[PDB]
């Protein structure tokens, strides 16, 4: 099965279904900042 390793910079979206809204948006460069 394919591996997905989130071990470098990534963008994140948190979405709500009923309104199709972006609740939060970001980029994680350093998760321990």
């Amino acid at each position: 099965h394919p591996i997905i390793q989130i071990d470098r910079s990534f963008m994140l979206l948190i979405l709500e279904r009923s309104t199709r809204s972006i609740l939060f948006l970001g980029k994680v460069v350093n998760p321990t900042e």
């Binding site: 470098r8 994140l12 709500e16 948006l25 321990t32």
Partner: protein
């Protein structure tokens, strides 16, 4: 609401890209709905070009979506987001701290309270330090303790503050087993440097894609009800190109393409926070008359005697094995015109 979806998403990504310029190669985290919702509230009290600038800055075209439809749509958004759903904590609302001597219009106060989830507090801004503390503690309460110290400084001539808050807490549809979390695993922060983070691990069926155009992996993780997370992992060296591509169009393409199948998934457990001073950014984006000596907030107070002076946002995020908690708040400050 569907049209509002694409427009609000594209505002989110345009503001995101402003932040990648202001704080380059740094963590970014914000609630675009919180910022959009605050500014639309402010626009309910605005008239003529002051009003049109705000909604045009938010991405609306007044030929396609007239001002009253924008207003209606955001009122419907805020209602829907707050409608109770089992296994999801999601609150979004607003507070208006209004100077004890201002003369707000019955219409504006009735609009915000009844149709926009707003609490109204008569505030004595002659005690600025006490008002700042009051406002920060209210936001801290409304965010379940998560957004502390929203307002670092208030201008001494402040006469009104508008705050929007959002709080979200949800469980993963497929939680991680903490016995499979690796206590210290490497996360690459730049080409030659790693940091140690706890790395969660699960092999599960997830919707996922490799975008063959944008050179990135996209991984969908659902919350148990009414919400999902998207993780966008660019190929090495490709973050800027992915950032430039992100749009409503991209999201609609992913919505079609993602396919559910087995994935051996590693995700960090972590917390981050971010703060933004938005006054100058919003001016650059097109909100100009609101700051001016000729601001038109005729719909807000009898004497139209206020202008916007400052704007700021703070947002926080935690991801772990059970799910996600996130919160945000947006502050708009006004002074005598």
């Amino acid at each position: 609401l569907y049209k509002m979806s694409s427009i609000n998403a594209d505002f989110a990504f345009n503001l995101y890209r402003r932040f990648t310029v202001e704080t380059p190669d740094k963590n970014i985290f914000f609630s675009p709905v919180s910022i959009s919702a605050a500014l639309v509230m402010l626009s309910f009290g605005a008239c003529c070009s002051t009003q049109t600038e705000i909604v045009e800055t938010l991405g609306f075209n007044l030929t396609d979506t007239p001002m009253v439809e924008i207003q209606h749509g955001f009122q419907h958004l805020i209602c829907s987001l707050n409608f109770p759903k089992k296994e999801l904590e999601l609150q979004i609302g607003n507070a208006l701290f209004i100077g004890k001597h201002l003369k707000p219009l019955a219409k504006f106060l009735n609009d915000v309270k009844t149709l926009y989830e707003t609490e109204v507090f008569s505030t004595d801004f002659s005690n600025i330090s006490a008002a700042k503390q009051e406002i920060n503690s209210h936001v801290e309460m409304q965010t379940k303790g998560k957004v502390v110290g929203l307002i670092q400084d208030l201008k001494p001539n402040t006469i009104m503050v508008l705050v929007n808050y959002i709080h979200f807490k949800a469980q993963w549809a497929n939680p991680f087993d903490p016995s499979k979390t690796e206590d210290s695993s490497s996360f690459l922060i730049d080409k030659t440097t790693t940091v140690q983070v706890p790395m969660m691990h699960q092999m599960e069926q997830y919707y996922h894609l490799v975008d063959m155009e944008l050179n990135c992996t996209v991984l969908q993780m659902d919350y148990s009800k009414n919400a999902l997370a998207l993780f966008v992992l660019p190929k090495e060296g490709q973050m800027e190109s992915v950032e430039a591509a992100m749009s409503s169009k991209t999201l609609k393409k992913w919505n079609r393409l993602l396919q559910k199948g087995w994935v051996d998934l590693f995700v960090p457990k972590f917390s981050i926070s971010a703060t933004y001073d938005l006054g100058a950014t919003l001016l650059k984006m097109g909100i100009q008359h609101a700051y001016s000596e000729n601001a038109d907030f005729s719909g807000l107070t009898e004497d139209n005697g206020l202008k916007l002076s400052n704007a700021a946002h703070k947002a926080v995020l935690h991801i772990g094995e059970k799910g996600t908690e996130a919160a945000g708040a947006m502050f708009l400050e006004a002074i005598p015109r």
